[PDB]
Amino acid sequence: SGFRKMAFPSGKVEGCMVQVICGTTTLNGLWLDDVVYCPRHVICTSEDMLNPNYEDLLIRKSNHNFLVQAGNVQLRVIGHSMQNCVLKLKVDTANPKTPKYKFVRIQPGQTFSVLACYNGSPSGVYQCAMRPNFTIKGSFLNGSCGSVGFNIDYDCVSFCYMHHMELPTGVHAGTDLEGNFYGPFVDRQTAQAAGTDTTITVNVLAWLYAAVINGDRWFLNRFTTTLNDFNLVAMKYNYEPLTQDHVDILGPLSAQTGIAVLDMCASLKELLQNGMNGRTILGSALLEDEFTPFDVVRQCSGVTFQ
Amino acid sequence: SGFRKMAFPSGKVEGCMVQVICGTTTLNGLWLDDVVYCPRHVICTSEDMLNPNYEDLLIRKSNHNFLVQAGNVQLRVIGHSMQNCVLKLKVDTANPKTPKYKFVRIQPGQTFSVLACYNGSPSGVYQCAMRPNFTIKGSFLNGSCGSVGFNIDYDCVSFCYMHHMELPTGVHAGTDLEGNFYGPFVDRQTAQAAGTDTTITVNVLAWLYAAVINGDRWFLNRFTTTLNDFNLVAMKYNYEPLTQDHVDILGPLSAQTGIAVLDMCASLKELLQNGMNGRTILGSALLEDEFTPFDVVRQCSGVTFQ
Numbered sequence A, B: 001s002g003f004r005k006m007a008f009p010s011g012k013v014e015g016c017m018v019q020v021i022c023g024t025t026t027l028n029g030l031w032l033d034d035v036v037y038c039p040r041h042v043i044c045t046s047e048d049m050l051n052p053n054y055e056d057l058l059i060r061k062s063n064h065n066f067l068v069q070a071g072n073v074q075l076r077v078i079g080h081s082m083q084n085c086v087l088k089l090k091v092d093t094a095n096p097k098t099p100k101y102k103f104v105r106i107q108p109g110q111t112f113s114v115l116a117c118y119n120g121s122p123s124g125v126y127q128c129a130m131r132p133n134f135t136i137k138g139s140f141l142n143g144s145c146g147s148v149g150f151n152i153d154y155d156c157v158s159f160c161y162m163h164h165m166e167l168p169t170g171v172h173a174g175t176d177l178e179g180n181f182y183g184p185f186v187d188r189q190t191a192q193a194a195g196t197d198t199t200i201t202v203n204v205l206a207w208l209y210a211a212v213i214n215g216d217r218w219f220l221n222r223f224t225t226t227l228n229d230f231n232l233v234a235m236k237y238n239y240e241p242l243t244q245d246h247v248d249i250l251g252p253l254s255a256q257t258g259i260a261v262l263d264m265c266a267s268l269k270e271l272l273q274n275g276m277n278g279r280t281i282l283g284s285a286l287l288e289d290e291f292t293p294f295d296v297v298r299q300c301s302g303v304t305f306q
């Protein structure tokens, strides 16, 4: 029993992290086969970042302007190109630690692990969700850019995020590994703000199932509801609408616990209308929305990885 | 900015996890040099666990009764012994992935990362604190025993916990790597219960400093207090006493923020007497006590590891 915010084991990703230095700017890169991927603003001075023309800045660089450090070994850059907001540095050595991997673009509400790195070295690992407003609530300092987010499937690492920037309220924005930002943000140091965020309803329901699996059952009422009736109430409280796809995704947890999804929706509706009355669920005084249905199954059923 | 419950990167520990099978019982072992460490109840049938005589059960086993699987390779057991609640299996191959390591016994209030494993394979990583009542609030299922807790120091893995059992309320108990339990628990399936837990005051103060570093400052009052006056109030609310050692440990965060430890104690005292008035700190509606002063420094300053 017990339920914690759990990250994937990080070893496969640790083997891919390198340091990328361009002049004086230093950040992290991801070394897969003979390519190192990193944020393009590694080519910027502090002044350039205020209003960069990345195409112009990259013109002015040759392969020799990039230093890649992998442990005690320097890797020679023998080609470079830009793909959206990511720089791809071809190096003279393919990484012998390259895991089976994919590049994926995730949907809002999906979760992933972040290996927070500085100077090519890992600092720590934590779990994040892609928020509906296309930010993540991470923990990142200067030099963290190029840290990646990922999921594991048996032996395959699905990279879904590369870190680029921090927005007001201290939330974070970045790209997929093709360099395309999540959300309407740009890699320029000028005032930008995330839109109003919303609560990921399907994930809250997943976490209520996790609570029931763990014996935290006080919030279960005797009611049911229609999907339409639930959604009008949740829209009031800045919850995302629940779709039939979400209901279908919750099926395995519903069958395990013997609680129909619409019955759990009625329980959630009561929590939204009445509050928690000074009680906790799984040790939290707030409803938690950063566990997906699969996260609950993976953790409560002991799914392992190679 | 941002502040998350962060685990250490797990790769060095992943390289040490193996499967130990004794007859039909299967759990995890820790492979370091030519020794595999695992919980002694691997030698128990389900019936034995109700009231085991481990010395008698181990008599009856030979080296051939233990199978150790490390990836696709089976390791021959060529010796065995018992050290308190841990079994040590000498194998014919030293682990080439053995990191620099130490065995340490931690104090209540200290934190560590857990690599939760099943069948020798990692499932996930999360951060835990040793509670004042010598339990940890983990997430563990059948077959998780032998999963370890650890801290990293540059390149050195300090192993501090091996998982053995779950107690009522769904909290967890285990041993150091010499097999000595934390707390007054025994590895027998009979009714046991943790004593009343308390809140780790020095860690709450560390987390309030983390909040201030992140700009969450609404709870800072204009008062100071003596250490004695603070401790009488906190004792009322089941908080551990704050010692001069704790004050000294908080010094670096106090100096960084320019907030005297006793001033932050006055702020905490007000939160305990008045509550949070429907507000959050670092996104939490409850005061958090599972970040140590070093955890706050490591995360907010970007300390990395080899």
Ligand SMILES: *C(=N)[C@H](C[C@@H]1CCNC1=O)NC(=O)[C@@H]1[C@@H]2[C@H](CN1C(=O)[C@@H](NC(=O)C(F)(F)F)C(C)(C)C)C2(C)C
Residues within 6 Å of the ligand: A027, A041, A044, A049, A140, A141, A142, A143, A144, A145, A146, A163, A164, A165, A166, A167, A168, A172, A186, A187, A188, A189, A190, A191, A192, A193, B001
């Ligand atoms: C990569 N190493 C850093 C990570 C930042 C640093 C502080 N917390 C983080 O996550 N990325 C940056 O410093 C980027 C980078 C220029 C400026 N920047 C920012 O994150 C800034 N944010 C913005 O300008 C805003 F609001 F638009 F997001 C900063 C004020 C430094 C937080 C570039 C090229 C965007």
Ligand SMILES: *C(=N)[C@H](C[C@@H]1CCNC1=O)NC(=O)[C@@H]1[C@@H]2[C@H](CN1C(=O)[C@@H](NC(=O)C(F)(F)F)C(C)(C)C)C2(C)C
Residues within 6 Å of the ligand: A001, B027, B041, B044, B049, B140, B141, B142, B143, B144, B145, B146, B163, B164, B165, B166, B167, B168, B172, B186, B187, B188, B189, B190, B191, B192, B193
């Ligand atoms: C190791 N693989 C498991 C981990 C357990 C399983 C459920 N959650 C966990 O953390 N260890 C055990 O099953 C141990 C083991 C016998 C029984 N046991 C327990 O954890 C039981 N707890 C107790 O008997 C109590 F209350 F004393 F802690 C159980 C009822 C199965 C939760 C031995 C040898 C102690």
Ligand SMILES: CCN(CC)CC(=O)Nc1c(C)cccc1C
Residues within 6 Å of the ligand: A098, A099, A100, A101, A102, A156
């Ligand atoms: C790059 C796109 N992927 C899609 C799965 C191919 C791949 O990962 N191949 C791969 C395999 C099969 C074993 C070990 C290492 C690698 C890199």
Ligand SMILES: CCN(CC)CC(=O)Nc1c(C)cccc1C
Residues within 6 Å of the ligand: B098, B099, B100, B101, B102, B156
């Ligand atoms: C076992 C007790 N430790 C105390 C630090 C010795 C140690 O870890 N030695 C070690 C070194 C120095 C480098 C690589 C691997 C190992 C095992």
